[PDB]
Ligand binder design. Structure first.
Ligand SMILES: Cc1c(Cn2c(=O)c(C(=O)O)cn(-c3ccc4c(c3)n(C)c(=O)n4C)c2=O)cccc1C(F)(F)F
Ligand SMILES: *[C@@H]1O[C@H](CO)[C@@H](O[C@@H]2O[C@H](CO)[C@@H](O)[C@H](O)[C@H]2NC(C)=O)[C@H](O)[C@H]1NC(C)=O
Ligand SMILES: *[C@@H]1O[C@H](CO)[C@@H](O[C@@H]2O[C@H](CO)[C@@H](O)[C@H](O)[C@H]2NC(C)=O)[C@H](O)[C@H]1NC(C)=O
Ligand SMILES: [Zn+2]
Length: 215
């Protein structure tokens, strides 16, 4: 998160920190959010050979009693996900067991909010703490330069006259507008100039329900 502020610890108890393993590189990291006690929603580009989810985190460097580190048994990447266009950048992770509900862990032109442990600048490392930024939902014309952006599938997020933005490592986290999840961090410019592209969750609700009912 660029231009955000550190959250009060555990103030976003649905937030999930993902560590993604690949067979041919080191760990990669994403966000996500707990939508059922045994399901996490995130971005399809966060898929890997294996994933561990950490719920209840604030400072991801300092293990504490709120932590619940949970195995993912199965990854459900949207079947039309496209690795070039990042159309349909959405994925459900089924956890091996249902999470415990605690104070720190629970399920989930207007201004929306996005939180994450990602980089705090183009050349800065990922944040040790959960950060949150308020971003403006933009008309789709603001994202035209993203040639594969589609207004029906995606949201256009972030005033280009502000530096505020999600960035690397924030992929998969939710954009909340009026306390409801509307977007998923997907992609943007390498130089972090807003706006960025989010997955429009509403489009995918039938697919989400289909997976949840079959698993
Ligand atoms: C995740 C992210 C990123 C990361 N990022 C890169 O850093 C990056 C690079 O080259 O280093 C490239 N991409 C990329 C990924 C996909 C892209 C695409 C660009 N463009 C321009 C495009 O049309 N597609 C489909 C990235 O998404 C940048 C800005 C914002 C955000 C977000 F959090 F807001 F989503
Ligand atoms: C997040 O937690 C880590 C671990 O407690 C903190 O890292 C310590 O930070 C101090 C000074 O910032 C260093 O001198 C120590 O060496 C660090 N310890 C370890 C184990 O690396 C970090 O400051 C915390 N970040 C917060 C709360 O913002
Ligand atoms: C991912 O999306 C790309 C971009 O649309 C697809 O590539 C296009 O596929 C159509 C249909 O085969 C062709 O007519 C275009 O020429 C292709 N364009 C490019 C730039 O290659 C691609 O097929 C998709 N991949 C998957 C597996 O979904
Ligand atoms: Zn704590």
């Amino acid at each position: 998160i660029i231009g955000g502020t550190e959250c009060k610890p555990h103030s976003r108890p649905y937030m999930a920190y993902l560590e993604i393993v690949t067979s041919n590189g080191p760990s990669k990291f994403c966000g996500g959010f707990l939508i059922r006690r045994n399901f996490v929603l995130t971005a399809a580009h966060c898929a890997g050979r294996s994933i561990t989810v950490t719920l209840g985190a604030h400072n991801i460097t300092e293990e504490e009693d709120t932590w619940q580190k949970l195995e993912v048994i199965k990854q459900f990447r949207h079947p039309k996900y496209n690795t070039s266009t990042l159309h349909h950048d959405i994925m459900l992770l089924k956890l091996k067991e249902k999470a415990s509900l605690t104070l720190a862990v629970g399920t989930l032109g207007r201004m929306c909010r996005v939180a994450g442990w990602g980089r705090t600048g183009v050349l800065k490392p990922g944040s040790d703490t959960l950060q949150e930024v308020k971003l403006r939902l933009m008309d789709p014309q603001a994202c035209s330069h993203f040639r594969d952006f589609d207004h029906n599938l995606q949201l256009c997020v972030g005033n280009p006259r502000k530096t505020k933005s999600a960035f690397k490592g924030d992929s998969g986290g939710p954009l909340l507008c009026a306390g409801a999840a509307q977007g998923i961090v997907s992609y943007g410019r390498s130089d972090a100039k807003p706006p960025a592209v989010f997955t429009r969750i509403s489009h995918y609700q039938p697919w989400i329900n289909q997976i949840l009912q079959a698993n």
